[PDB]
């Protein structure tokens, strides 16, 4: 395989060319959340809107705990919801034209990769069990 990832630096504080307060970032991220944007998109729009590194550095904690604190939690986590959305999209395309055997293969693979994460989420019990992908 290959490596391509971020390299979060050695410092663990706000990078001191910052010229902005702490709760203003909280207001910005709850504003984007009430606009209805997913947490990873909050993270990139906060990397580029005003110069934060990420919220665990600039605020006191991560965006998932700060959105659960501000009351805008997601009922299912990001990767779970995105794999479900990809699964239903490729299922809709295959039911448009059933001859796509590569889409059948990829639907089986996405079903496996979502049942693995559903097994993890049920065994850690952060979503309510009986949840087994419809």
């Amino acid at each position: 395989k290959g490596i391509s990832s971020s390299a979060i630096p050695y410092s663990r504080n706000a990078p001191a060319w910052f010229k902005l307060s702490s709760e203003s970032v909280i207001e910005q991220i709850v504003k984007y959340a009430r606009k209805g944007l997913t947490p990873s998109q909050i993270g990139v729009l906060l990397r580029d809107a005003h110069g934060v590194t990420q919220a665990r550095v600039i605020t006191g904690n991560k965006i998932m705990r700060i959105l659960k604190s501000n009351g805008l939690a997601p009922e299912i986590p990001e990767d779970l919801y995105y794999l479900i959305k990809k699964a239903v999209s490729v299922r809709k395309h295959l039911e448009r034209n059933r001859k796509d055997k590569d889409a059948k293969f990829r639907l089986i693979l996405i079903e496996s990769r979502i049942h693995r994460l559903a097994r993890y989420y049920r065994t850690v019990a952060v979503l309510p069990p009986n949840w087994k992908y419809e």
Binding site: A7, I8, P9, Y10, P15, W17, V44, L45, D48, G51
Partner: peptide, 30 residues
């Protein structure tokens, strides 16, 4: 010790001459 090679840079908006911060590898039309 691995770390970044992207720098944060401040840009002057040519329309209204104010300043804003922007990432190097910007990933979005800011």
């Amino acid at each position: 010790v691995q770390g970044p090679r992207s720098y944060f840079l401040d840009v002057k908006c040519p329309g209204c001459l104010n300043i804003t911060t922007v990432f190097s590898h910007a990933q979005t039309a800011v």
